[PDB]
Every structure is written in structure tokens, then in C-alpha cells.
Design a protein around this nucleic acid. Structure first.
Ligand SMILES: [K+]
Ligand SMILES: [K+]
Ligand SMILES: [Mg+2]
Ligand SMILES: [Mg+2]
Ligand SMILES: [Mg+2]
Ligand SMILES: [Mg+2]
Ligand SMILES: [Mg+2]
Ligand SMILES: [Mg+2]
Ligand SMILES: [Mg+2]
Ligand code: NA
Length: 186
RNA sequence: UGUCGAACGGCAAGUGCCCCGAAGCCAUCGCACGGUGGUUCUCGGCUGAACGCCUCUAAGCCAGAAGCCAAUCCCAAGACCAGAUGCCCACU
């Protein structure tokens, strides 16, 4: 067992990170995020004067140590979520039947996927903003916006997995909704 | 057919026999009704290290089968209900 293993992260000026009982609260501009990490059993420290976040595993083998970088990635993702945000742009790809997508409030409706009469409905949580790009700029583009990377990516994946092609050769029937670009709001 | 003399009324033939026949029982041979949510499988994914890259997995999440569990349905306190009540009596 390695006696001490640690990971370090620089904290920007406009964000504050608070740690208490393995519960991380990252609060910059544009909002605040909270991550429950009570399942990890690590030692989390924040030096506010030096703007550093440190996670330490004491007497760890490979399995406990591998969670150090995972915690660092999660805290980093929260930081860029509260500073710049997350924006996912997904595209509707079709061969013959156009994919008609309607976005009203927090509800997405997909019709005419491969000519099916069934309507595919999805309810986006209020923490993720959904919008449709005007067709003149980009054709068949849905944009998901939020501060939580996991919430934003889950919403895009949920939409993508709704329009799966069944009982067909997927190498030839490439119709679906795929996320094209992943960027930041600011 | 026999029989009380005939007619009437019947009666015998272990319901004489034939037709129709209510009530009741009864036929997918007739008619009525047969519903709601979760936990997971397999699998597909998200985030993501180990291993600066990568990766559904290692810690975390999402979606998810006629399986499984509960609701609904049937019996139901030896499941000993200090559940709620109506009248007496007992205690007071
Ligand atoms: K006879
Ligand atoms: K008859
Ligand atoms: Mg076929
Ligand atoms: Mg007779
Ligand atoms: Mg005689
Ligand atoms: Mg019957
Ligand atoms: Mg999986
Ligand atoms: Mg099931
Ligand atoms: Mg009872
Ligand atoms: Na990945």
C-alpha cells in the first residue's frame, strides 16, 4: 500500500469550492453545483488562500487510488460548469423520412422517425435548457444547455437512445439523432 | 290395451305412449366481465479514472424483458388486533 497518494487542482478566481463530509459544493457565477461523494472515503481539502483543491488517499491499493483522479475530474467538471457551462448540439440524420422535432418548454417530441407513427416524448429536467436552432442556420439541430455535465450528457444520450433502429441492418439504416459538438455556453 | 255396466270421472301397464309445456337448472350451443406501478436480468449508454491517451466500470449514474416483487383480486388475528363500537353485568 502507498502511504500517501494525492491529487491537486487549481481553482479560478470567480469560483469557491467548499468541502464538508466528502460533499463538494462548487459555487461560482451563473450558479452552484453540489456533488455527493460519501461513497469514496477520501480526504478532501481546500486551501482558499492558495485556491487549491486537494484529495488524498491514505494507505491505498490500486482500487482506492484510482478514485483520486475521478474525484479531481468531477470537481474540475463542476468548475467549468459554473464558469462556462456545457452546451451539447445534436443533429437529426435521416435518409428518406425527415425527423420532426418539437421543443415546447421542457418537453421534446420526435415524430416520423423512419416513418413510424409513434410519437417519442422526453421530459427534460429544468436544470437543463433545451432549444431548437433555427432551420436557416443549422438544419435539424437540438441544443442542450446546463451547468452539470452529467445531466447535459444524459439528456443528449436519452434523446439519442430513443431513436434507435430496430429489426433492420443498422449499417445501412443510419437514421437517428447523434450529438455532433460538445462545447461551452460562454 | 285392459278395467270399474255405459257416459262422466278415472284407474292399471314400476312416468303406457305421443305433442306442446312454465318455474328451476343449464351450453363458448346463449350472454357479461377479465386493470396499476416498481426492482432488476441480458444489453445499450452517460460521466470517468486505473494507465497524461483510451475505456459502460473500477467509485458513481441513465434507460431497461411475457422473469421477479408489490397494488388490484381470494382466504384471512394460532398474526392471539392496547382497532373502533352497541347493550347489560362486574369494579368503582
Ligand atoms: K312400458
Ligand atoms: K320439448
Ligand atoms: Mg430484416
Ligand atoms: Mg294411470
Ligand atoms: Mg289390479
Ligand atoms: Mg357455460
Ligand atoms: Mg452498463
Ligand atoms: Mg421486469
Ligand atoms: Mg377478522
Ligand atoms: Na469516456
Amino acid at each position: 500500500v502507498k502511504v500517501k497518494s494525492l491529487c491537486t487542482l487549481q481553482i479560478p478566481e470567480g469560483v469557491t469550492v467548499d468541502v464538508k463530509g466528502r460533499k463538494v459544493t462548487v459555487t461560482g457565477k451563473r450558479g452552484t453545483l453540489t456533488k455527493d461523494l460519501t461513497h469514496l472515503q477520501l480526504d478532501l481539502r481546500v486551501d482558499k488562500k492558495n485556491r487549491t483543491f486537494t484529495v488524498i488517499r491514505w494507505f491505498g491499493s490500486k482500487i482506492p487510488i484510482a478514485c483520486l483522479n475521478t474525484t479531481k475530474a468531477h470537481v474540475q467538471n463542476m468548475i467549468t460548469g459554473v464558469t462556462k457551462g456545457y452546451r451539447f448540439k445534436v443533429r437529426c440524420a435521416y435518409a428518406h423520412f425527415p425527423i420532426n422535432v418539437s421543443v415546447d418548454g421542457q418537453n421534446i417530441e420526435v415524430r416520423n422517425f423512419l416513418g413510424e407513427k409513434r410519437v417519442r416524448r422526453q421530459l427534460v429536467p429544468n436544470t437543463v435548457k433545451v432549444s431548437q436552432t433555427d432551420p436557416s442556420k443549422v438544419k435539424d439541430e437540438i441544443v442542450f444547455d446546463g451547468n452539470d455535465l452529467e445531466q447535459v450528457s444524459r439528456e443528449a444520450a436519452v434523446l439519442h437512445q430513443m431513436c434507435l433502429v430496430k429489426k433492420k441492418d443498422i449499417r445501412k439504416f443510419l437514421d437517428g439523432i447523434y450529438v455532433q459538438t460538445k462545447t461551452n455556453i460562454e
